[PDB]
């Protein structure tokens, strides 16, 4: 969790917020129970407490975001390490939230030119948007830089 960047916490926090069902900042066996029996398989109220209490460091029975982060330290994103792509993203991202959206990237090309139509911008996203939310992660942006 130490050698992260701004684009990896701000990515994981929206992953955590969608994962935390009731929005309490913690994770129970109920809350991890709901979004796994939606995923076809059925955790039979035993792997829930086996998985959470495995990674629960302070032993409170719950998983806050840093203990969520230290499990995403061992299950971290791969060795896709760059430096120039780190710079041009903060050039691209206005508010610095790690998410370059349809409203923010349409302005960067407006500073550069060629007169993009509004529907041309949204097609630039769906080529890049792997998970399908209309916004481009840094991981979803770094594969669009070289790409071949």
């Amino acid at each position: 969790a130490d050698q992260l960047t701004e684009e990896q916490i701000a990515e994981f926090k929206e992953a955590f917020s969608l994962f935390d069902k009731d929005g309490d900042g913690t994770i129970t066996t109920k809350e991890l129970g709901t979004v796994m029996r939606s995923l076809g398989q059925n955790p039979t109220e035993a792997e829930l407490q086996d998985m959470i209490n495995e990674v629960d460091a302070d032993g409170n029975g719950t998983i806050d975001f840093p203990e969520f982060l230290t499990m995403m330290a061992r299950k971290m994103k791969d060795t896709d390490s760059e430096e120039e792509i780190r710079e041009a993203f903060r050039v691209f991202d206005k508010d610095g939230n790690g998410y370059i959206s349809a409203a923010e990237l349409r302005h960067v090309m407006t500073n550069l030119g060629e007169k993009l139509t509004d529907e041309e911008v949204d097609e630039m996203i769906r080529e890049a948007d792997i998970d399908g939310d209309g916004q481009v992660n840094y991981e979803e942006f770094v594969q669009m830089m070289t790409a071949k």
């Binding site: 701004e6 701000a10 009731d22 900042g25 995923l39 610095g96 939230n97 630039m124």
Partner: protein, 644 residues
């Protein structure tokens, strides 16, 4: 600017007095050998100064030299407390510098020897100023919790540094973290401030306003901090129930729509100048309100107040077209050029009862022009003229036309009942400012709105840089045209007879509205044709047809930001009414407490579709389970736009 220059001379002077006085220079280059062989026998000089009155201890932290720093505390165990006696760096202690350079071992060495953890770094560079490069407050805890070294932040609390600590702006450490731009660590650290303390039950420490009276939740509305605003929204966001893809969410809404007590976050947004704060209006617990508050109430009350203005000008137009007029009072037009066969009446004509009906038509006006002055002048004393002659469009220049309107009507009232002659002139500015002030009521229309933003954004910004160009050229050719025709008849081809006509006729050939002078009965002078054709190319097909391209240059480069202006025009129209209308007819927004078991605050209910998307969460669930062509070209250029 001889101030910032005077910084430099006191910074190169430090880099003279360190080449002198060798116990500084042995301290800079980490020379443990000379430091023993300058102090351990005679010494006599441990309390030296510098350009900032600093110490050798201040050098050994400013350059990361642990080794001499341990020895200087061992040799002279009294240097840790004295601050920098200076002007720029005033009050700065050696506890501060070891923090900002991340130097954990030295901080662990200074605190074990023990320094004042609440020292006042009250220097001149440290003020929140638009020229300096960092603003880190004044306290070592504030310097700790800004660079992000959270392990230091755990340590300063354990030796007793209070969170409750205000600078000259009254800011706590919570107000500081909103101001740094590299945000995204502070959200990981804002919780860590709350984890240890925040009091237990004093005020919960997030409520403490600054010297300008503002909690951190209001402060994120002014500073445009989008990440903190979502992160502070998690505290006041209550999830009610889930139903498949539907979840209903109930918001606190305590400070967002305080509805009075004019420190309101809807009030504070349309007051500021920071452009990046105006995009709070797209975050989902606020844009629900200003959709409702404007559609159910702010739309009909605005248009009804729109229609009451439309009759008022028609009540003023229909009376100005019925001035009284005497035919050619006593004179006879002698010389020339006096096609003026009427004359207005003296004030001895209110006979003929199709003239008393005029009198109510002028009396509705003069009592209508004072109610503008009864409602705009009580705005200059609460808020200065920097809102009036400031062209912040959220209540822009339509608050200075209407005041000029309410002045120009009453001048005619003084022109009447005096028998003064020229009442045409104040009445003429009364009409053209009268009708063009209905343009303000083109603000709350879905269609007519963002066109009106563009007309104002071409007056001040793309016509000013034309009219300075036009007044150069048109002063040249007019005096050139006047000289040619000075030795000519004005009877035939008389567009230029005296000089202040010769600007005005030349003003109307740059616009192609008069035809350009020509008389084929007579012989025009040979220098006219050469001069005028040279003017014809520059005026007609080189300065006007450049201006049309100039408009279309800037019309597709702000049509993402006039819609964002137009949305903020509506909210500034909405919130202005609620302060101004009496609250017998606007209900309070949302649902109150104390009838439900709620807790007296006014809540609001938002319910939305979350989509599940099946792909991103299965990627994480495989980590939760521990295991054992046109678009491509636009990204090809964007790679080539990244420029290696």
């Amino acid at each position: 600017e001889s101030w910032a220059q005077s910084r430099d001379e006191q910074n190169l002077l430090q880099q003279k007095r360190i080449w002198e006085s060798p116990l500084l220079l042995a301290a800079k280059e980490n020379n443990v050998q000379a430091l023993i062989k300058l102090l351990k026998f005679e010494g006599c000089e441990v309390h030296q100064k510098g350009a900032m009155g600093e110490t050798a201890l201040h050098i050994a932290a400013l350059y990361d030299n642990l080794e001499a720093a341990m020895v200087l505390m061992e040799a002279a165990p009294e240097l840790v407390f004295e601050p920098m006696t200076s002007e720029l760096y005033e009050g700065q202690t050696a506890l501060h510098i070891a923090v900002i350079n991340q130097n954990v071992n030295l901080v662990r060495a200074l605190l074990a020897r023990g320094a004042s953890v609440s020292a006042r770094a009250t220097g001149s560079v440290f003020h929140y100023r638009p020229h300096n490069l960092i603003y880190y407050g004044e306290h070592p805890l504030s310097f700790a919790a800004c660079v992000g070294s959270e392990e230091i932040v755990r340590l300063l609390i354990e030796h007793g540094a209070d969170i409750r600590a205000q600078d000259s702006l009254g800011n706590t450490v919570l107000h500081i973290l909103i101001l740094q731009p590299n945000k995204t660590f502070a959200c990981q650290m804002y919780n860590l401030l709350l984890s240890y303390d925040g009091g237990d039950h004093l005020k919960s420490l997030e409520l403490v306003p600054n010297n300008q009276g503002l909690t951190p939740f209001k402060l994120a509305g002014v500073e445009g901090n989008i990440v903190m605003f979502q992160h502070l929204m998690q505290k006041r966001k209550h999830i009610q129930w889930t139903y498949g893809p539907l979840t209903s969410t109930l918001y606190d809404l305590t400070e967002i729509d305080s509805s009075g007590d004019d420190q309101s976050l809807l009030e504070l947004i349309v007051t500021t100048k920071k452009r990046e704060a105006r995009q709070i209006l797209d975050q989902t617990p606020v844009k629900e309100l200003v959709s409702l508050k404007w559609k159910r109430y702010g739309r009909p009350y605005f248009c009804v107040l729109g229609a009451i203005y439309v009759l008022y000008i028609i009540c003023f137009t229909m009376c100005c077209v019925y001035r009284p007029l005497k035919p050619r009072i006593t004179n006879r037009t002698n010389p020339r050029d006096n096609t003026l066969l009427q004359q207005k009446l003296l004030q001895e004509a209110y006979v003929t009862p199709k003239d008393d009906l005029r009198l109510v038509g002028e009396l509705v006006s003069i009592v209508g022009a004072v109610i503008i002055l009864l409602v705009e002048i009580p705005d200059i004393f609460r808020l200065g003229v920097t809102r009036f002659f400031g062209q912040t469009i959220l209540g822009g220049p339509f608050h200075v036309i209407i005041v000029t309107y309410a002045f120009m009507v009453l001048v005619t009232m003084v022109m009447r009942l005096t028998n003064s002659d020229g009442e045409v002139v104040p009445m003429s500015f009364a009409l053209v400012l009268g009708w063009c002030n209905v343009m303000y009521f083109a603000r709350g229309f879905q269609m007519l709105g963002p066109f009106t933003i563009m007309i104002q954004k071409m007056i001040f910004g793309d016509l000013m840089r034309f009219c300075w160009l036009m007044a150069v050229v048109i002063l040249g050719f007019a005096s050139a045209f006047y000289i040619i025709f000075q030795t000519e008849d004005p009877d035939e081809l008389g567009h230029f007879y005296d000089y202040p006509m010769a600007l005005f006729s030349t003003f109307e050939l740059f616009l192609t509205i008069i035809d350009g002078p020509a008389n084929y009965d007579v012989d025009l002078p040979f220098m006219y044709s050469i001069t005028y054709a040279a003017f014809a190319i520059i005026a007609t097909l080189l300065m006007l047809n450049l201006l049309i391209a100039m408009m279309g240059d800037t019309h597709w480069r702000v049509a993402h930001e006039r819609d964002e202006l137009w949305r903020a025009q509506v909210v500034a129209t909405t919130v202005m009414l609620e302060r101004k209308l009496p609250r017998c007819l606007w209900p309070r927004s949302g649902i109150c407490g104390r009838e439900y078991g709620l807790g007296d605050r006014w809540f609001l209910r938002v319910e939305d579709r979350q989509d599940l998307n099946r792909q991103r969460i299965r990627r994480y669930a495989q980590a939760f389970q521990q295991q054992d062509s046109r678009s491509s070209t636009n990204w090809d250029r964007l790679r080539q736009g990244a420029l290696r």
